[PDB]
Amino acid sequence: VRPLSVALGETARISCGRQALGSRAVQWYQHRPGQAPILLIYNNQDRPSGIPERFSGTPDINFGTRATLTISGVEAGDEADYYCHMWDSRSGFSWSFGGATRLTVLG
Amino acid sequence: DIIGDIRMAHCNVSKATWNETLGKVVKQLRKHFGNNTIIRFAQSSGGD
Amino acid sequence: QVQLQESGPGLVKPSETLSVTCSVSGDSMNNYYWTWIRQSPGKGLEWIGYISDRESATYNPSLNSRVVISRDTSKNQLSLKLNSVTPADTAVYYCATARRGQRIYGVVSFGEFFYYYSMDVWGKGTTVTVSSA
Amino acid sequence: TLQCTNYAPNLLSNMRGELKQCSFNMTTELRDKKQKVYSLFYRLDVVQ
Numbered sequence: 381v382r383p384l385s386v387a388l389g390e391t392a393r394i395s396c397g398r399q400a401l402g403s404r405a406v407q408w409y410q411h412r413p414g415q416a417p418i419l420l421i422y423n424n425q426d427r428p429s430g431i432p433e434r435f436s437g438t439p440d441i442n443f444g445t446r447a448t449l450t451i452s453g454v455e456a457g458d459e460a461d462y463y464c465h466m467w468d469s470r471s472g473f474s475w476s477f478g479g480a481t482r483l484t485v486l487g
Numbered sequence: 488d489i490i491g492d493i494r495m496a497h498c499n500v501s502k503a504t505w506n507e508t509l510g511k512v513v514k515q516l517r518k519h520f521g522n523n524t525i526i527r528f529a530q531s532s533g534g535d
Numbered sequence: 536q537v538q539l540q541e542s543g544p545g546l547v548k549p550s551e552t553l554s555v556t557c558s559v560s561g562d563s564m565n566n567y568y569w570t571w572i573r574q575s576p577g578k579g580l581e582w583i584g585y586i587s588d589r590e591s592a593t594y595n596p597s598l599n600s601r602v603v604i605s606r607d608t609s610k611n612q613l614s615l616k617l618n619s620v621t622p623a624d625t626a627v628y629y630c631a632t633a634r635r636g637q638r639i640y641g642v643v644s645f646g647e648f649f650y651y652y653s654m655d656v657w658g659k660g661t662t663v664t665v666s667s668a
Numbered sequence: 669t670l671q672c673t674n675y676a677p678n679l680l681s682n683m684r685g686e687l688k689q690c691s692f693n694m695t696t697e698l699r700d701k702k703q704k705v706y707s708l709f710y711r712l713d714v715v716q
């Protein structure tokens with residue numbers, strides 16, 4: 381569990397602390413406390429319907445890069461904790477999710 | 488060590504032109520065994 | 536469109552059996568895969584297990600197989616059973632669905648791929664606590 | 669003598685029984701000092 385703080389308006393860049401190794405295929409969730417977890421990004425590019433175009437991950441070409449999530453146009457409700465569910469080729473079947481990065485917008 | 492993805496080394500070959508090459512070489516082979524004898528290919532036998 | 540709603544006993548004394556069901560409304564469960572999520576206070580999320588059309592109750596090996604997965608397509612329900620329970624599992628539970636996507640990266644004739652599960656439709660969740668008192 | 673185990677465990681692909689990771693000792697330029705090293709080998713050259 382780790383915090384992070386970004387002021388109003390500008391972009392924010394979050395990356396999960398698990399060292400990816402191989403072909404990356406990650407998901408990004410969002411869990412407000414008390415509410416239900418919603419999906420944001422799957423298969424490193426794609427997006428379900430009902431999500432605005434302020435959410436962009438990284439295309440998984442030319443291995444050697446870190447997976448990260450960039451958001452733009454931050455607002456007041458953007459306060460929930462995030463998760464970086466990770467899958468590869470080498471490490472086999474995963475079970476856990478990982479430590480949640482707490483976003484704390486100020487302004 | 489290995490940086491990247493565990494894979495397995497392999498070899499490709501164009502399918503259609505290999506079949507046509509086998510069909511050509513069996514036509515040349517039939518000149519010693521009459522017209523109609525069954526020609527069959529098979530895998531290796533043994534050894535190292 | 537699939538809608539979810541839960542059903543739980545709420546307050547059960549420990550060393551007993553905990554059974555919490557989720558109701559499936561809107562569609563059937565022909566191709567959807569079904570999972571369970573535990574969220575305890577003082578930690579992060581935790582994933583429990585899943586089931587599919589071949590009825591594989593695949594369990595997390597960090598859970599000592601103390602839980603039982605139960606499905607019902609004759610009356611459109613899903614059921615948990617928890618045997619030999621602890622007093623230290625007071626948590627809201629979640630009944631969410633999941634789809635299976637594959638990703639092939641080499642050749643297909645060598646099995647050179649893997650599977651991943653993505654959980655898109657989620658439940659509102661209900662709180663079940665255990666207490667000796 | 670090589671103390672050695674399988675490298676890349678819990679892998680579900682074809683290439684599993686290859687790629688063993690071993691460890692041995694070896695003399696350095698000083699004949700009184702020795703050296704530890706980690707390395708890899710394929711399956712077809714090591715025998716238990």
Ligand SMILES: *[C@@H]1O[C@H](CO)[C@@H](O[C@@H]2O[C@H](CO)[C@@H](O[C@@H]3O[C@H](CO[C@H]4O[C@H](CO)[C@@H](O)[C@H](O)[C@@H]4O)[C@@H](O)[C@H](O[C@H]4O[C@H](CO)[C@@H](O)[C@H](O)[C@@H]4O[C@H]4O[C@H](CO)[C@@H](O)[C@H](O)[C@@H]4O)[C@@H]3O)[C@H](O)[C@H]2NC(C)=O)[C@H](O)[C@H]1NC(C)=O
Pocket residue numbers: 403423424425439440441442498499639640641642643644
């Ligand atoms: C000897 O002959 C064999 C013949 O089988 C040949 O095997 C082929 O090898 C290549 C190399 O790995 C395999 O190519 C992969 O193809 C998949 C297919 O996925 C889509 O592509 C086609 C149309 O292009 C669709 O029909 C199909 O249904 C899928 O939609 C790709 O997914 C692979 O690329 C991804 O992974 C690579 C490594 O991670 C990345 O470099 C690549 O960019 C892709 O990653 C991401 O890119 C997208 C960009 O937006 C992104 O959106 C995606 O989400 C993705 O994550 C890869 O190219 C091919 O499948 C093999 N053939 C078979 C039948 O399995 C050997 O190559 C050949 N060897 C020699 C030496 O000649």
Ligand SMILES: *[C@@H]1O[C@H](CO)[C@@H](O[C@@H]2O[C@H](CO)[C@@H](O)[C@H](O)[C@H]2NC(C)=O)[C@H](O)[C@H]1NC(C)=O
Pocket residue numbers: 669670671691692693704705
């Ligand atoms: C290197 O040689 C040493 C010499 O015997 C081997 O291991 C030693 O074993 C004794 C008793 O178990 C330990 O007290 C030493 O600390 C060990 N030393 C080392 C360097 O491991 C050992 O088998 C050899 N190492 C390898 C990798 O083959």
Ligand SMILES: *[C@@H]1O[C@H](CO)[C@@H](O)[C@H](O)[C@H]1NC(C)=O
Pocket residue numbers: 499500501
């Ligand atoms: C093999 O490699 C050559 C390299 O020039 C390429 O032109 C060809 O398309 C490849 N495939 C076959 C089947 O020859």
Ligand SMILES: *[C@@H]1O[C@H](CO)[C@@H](O)[C@H](O)[C@H]1NC(C)=O
Pocket residue numbers: 506507510
């Ligand atoms: C090979 O080539 C012949 C052409 O003479 C064709 O009739 C046949 O379908 C091809 N394939 C096989 C498997 O024989």
Ligand SMILES: *[C@@H]1O[C@H](CO)[C@@H](O)[C@H](O)[C@H]1NC(C)=O
Pocket residue numbers: 518520521522
């Ligand atoms: C095989 O058949 C061909 C058909 O063109 C014929 O010309 C040839 O004489 C025959 N050979 C034998 C050995 O029967």
